[PDB]
Design a protein around this ligand. Structure first.
Ligand SMILES: Nc1ncnc2c1ncn2[C@@H]1O[C@H](COP(=O)(O)O)[C@@H](O)[C@H]1O
Ligand SMILES: Nc1ncnc2c1ncn2[C@@H]1O[C@H](COP(=O)(O)O)[C@@H](O)[C@H]1O
Ligand SMILES: O=P(O)(O)OC[C@H]1O[C@](O)(CO)[C@@H](O)[C@@H]1O
Ligand SMILES: O=P(O)(O)OC[C@H]1O[C@](O)(CO)[C@@H](O)[C@@H]1O
Ligand SMILES: [Mg+2]
Ligand SMILES: [Mg+2]
Ligand SMILES: [Tl+]
Ligand SMILES: [Tl+]
Ligand SMILES: [Tl+]
Ligand SMILES: [Tl+]
Ligand SMILES: [Tl+]
Ligand SMILES: [Tl+]
Ligand SMILES: [Tl+]
Ligand SMILES: [Tl+]
Lengths: 327, 327
């Protein structure tokens, strides 16, 4: 009873009595992630280095991995005929879908996240969040300004040692492994739940000078626990999709809080924070700014930033108590 | 012209007037690394999950990633007819090659490192160090107990967003990107040199309570710089090969010093520290225990551990001066 993502998605659409438009959109997304994975793994790189001659144009201008991944997502998504508005980290304004290709969905995505890790080959990934068009007027940027609570689907693809697509919908989270020998995502983990308490903390301690008193206290607690329990281990890949995936599967906490220089945090609400907050809540974990659920935030700009703390419910509640403690 | 790793080692063997044994050893390593990469990226995994029913298996005989990598390196190394003693992290005793397949080389390797990161799909890698047998006695474990200074070649493969093989020899360090479309490593960065000073520090701060006063002062300095420069960013993937590769390519410093449960450090001298210390010094970087050069330690146990600090010379030197001050 092997379950490919293609068959999973078709069946959830049948169970939900969908008309086939959201199924097609998820099929197209699966296709774009496979194409991005292949480019990320550098298939055909020998051509760029002149294996078939013409090795003089080394002068970088040939589509960077980032620009290519964005082109794939946009073109594949438009070709699904299921979207009307697209929001991408790469584009200043929302992309409005042409009338002929227009569907009812709104898609926020980060085509390739973990940009500082690209050149050192560290894990990177793709993040997406899917909304249903809310108004009845002309599609525009305002259709992407819905709180995360209105998400129909969200998840990510991780381009790590292997490629995995994690997909969250109303009934739960499932993890599919890419078999690159046949171009098929295989269900390997069903209805995933995060553990109640972890033993790993994930944050860039280089900002220690700019952290707030609550974050400062919490970290001290992880290293020197007052009850003398075992100190947490530390992990910070520096790519959000990889640190968050580890969090989902191993437990613990992930933090990118505001700080003195980034008073609103660094991560983007629409296509970084909301999708992972959605994956985390559907797995039994939490996602907070420290004062409110990420998913309940009402966006006001498509490139708006928000602080985020996510992970095991007990670890996140502990930091929240510390925020309350500090008034 | 385009340069494959195959062409590179062959021409390097010709220039050195070798008999071809070391060339054959290096080509075998390159074959083992391709086969491990393909397994790591999960090609064929659908078969495990029953895409073809249950019949392609007589029993429960299946192998963990780590067991499979170990078996690929041992069997492919042996078949090169170039080795006489192998040391693997996975075997308590040195492996002595049968006389019929004996060559003059001693190889120390970690077939798959970063085991804590395997189930969460973070970057993992293969590490290797190569020595010439310096004796006329029957081959034995003692032939592996040489200081890293005696290495003839070392390096690693990183299975990250893409697969890369980094090879260091007497003349310098080179990086080859694997093109999985054609099964060819392609030379992409020549005679690599680390930056003299970096801006990233890499360590598990979870062990904060067990750190010596010099590591403690250094980390504080990275977060609250006396000259008021910008603090370093922090990165810690949790896989030595990923963190060391970022160090090489971006600069800065990587640390695993002694702690509680590792009063002599955690990382293994023969097949973790020495290969990385050799790449670093050949790249113009430094590698020290805090008190002496990693490459000059004379081992007495194939599985002995050592503390290690490595990376950009101005950064490692700064920490060495802390240690000297305290003393
Ligand atoms: N493949 C699917 N998987 C999960 N839910 C689906 C699927 N197809 C449709 N749905 C649900 O049914 C709604 C309407 O689908 P549609 O008619 O395709 O726009 C969607 O917004 C989802 O809530
Ligand atoms: N492909 C090669 N690349 C670099 N050095 C090599 C190569 N082949 C041989 N050498 C050097 O020449 C020595 C003798 O080689 P061999 O006769 O093959 O054992 C080796 O120990 C190396 O120091
Ligand atoms: O170096 P910093 O400030 O920790 O930023 C890293 C974060 O930025 C991102 O690259 C987003 O731009 C995330 O993937 C990652 O979590
Ligand atoms: O969890 P810790 O103690 O930081 O150990 C991390 C180290 O463990 C290893 O997995 C052991 O080889 C290294 O790859 C890594 O640098
Ligand atoms: Mg991003
Ligand atoms: Mg190891
Ligand atoms: Tl961004
Ligand atoms: Tl970007
Ligand atoms: Tl991006
Ligand atoms: Tl960001
Ligand atoms: Tl092991
Ligand atoms: Tl290992
Ligand atoms: Tl180790
Ligand atoms: Tl080890």
């Amino acid at each position: 009873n092997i379950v490919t993502l293609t068959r999973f998605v078709m069946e959830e659409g049948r169970k939900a009595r969908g008309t086939g438009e959201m199924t097609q959109l998820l099929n197209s997304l699966c296709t774009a992630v496979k194409a991005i994975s292949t480019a990320v793994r550098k298939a055909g790189i020998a051509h760029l280095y002149g294996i078939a001659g013409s090795t003089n144009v080394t002068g970088d201008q040939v589509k960077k991995l980032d620009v290519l991944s964005n082109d794939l997502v946009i073109n594949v998504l438009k070709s699904s005929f299921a979207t009307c508005v697209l929001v991408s980290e790469e584009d200043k304004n929302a992309i409005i879908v042409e009338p002929e290709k227009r569907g009812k969905y709104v898609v926020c995505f980060d085509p390739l996240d973990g940009s500082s890790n690209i050149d050192c080959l560290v894990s990177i990934g793709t993040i997406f969040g899917i909304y249903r068009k809310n108004s009845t007027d002309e599609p525009s940027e305002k259709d992407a300004l819905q709180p995360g609570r209105n998400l129909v689907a969200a998840g990510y693809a991780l381009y790590g040692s292997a490629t995995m697509l994690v997909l969250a919908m109303v009934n739960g989270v499932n993890c599919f492994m890419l078999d690159p020998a046949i171009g098929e995502f295989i269900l390997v983990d069903r209805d995933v739940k995060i553990k109640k308490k972890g033993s790993i903390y994930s944050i860039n301690e280089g900002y220690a000078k700019e952290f707030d008193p609550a974050i400062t206290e919490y970290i001290q607690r992880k290293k020197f626990p007052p009850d003398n329990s075992a100190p947490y281990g530390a992990r910070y890949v520096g790519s959000m999709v990889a640190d968050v995936h580890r969090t989902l599967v191993y437990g613990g906490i992930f933090m990118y809080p505001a700080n003195k220089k980034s008073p609103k945090g660094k991560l983007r609400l629409l296509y970084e924070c909301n999708p992972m907050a959605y994956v985390m809540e559907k797995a039994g974990g939490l996602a907070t700014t420290g004062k409110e659920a990420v998913l309940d935030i009402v966006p006001t700009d498509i490139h708006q930033r928000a602080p985020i703390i996510l992970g095991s419910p007990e670890d996140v509640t502990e930091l929240l108590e510390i925020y309350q403690k500090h008034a």
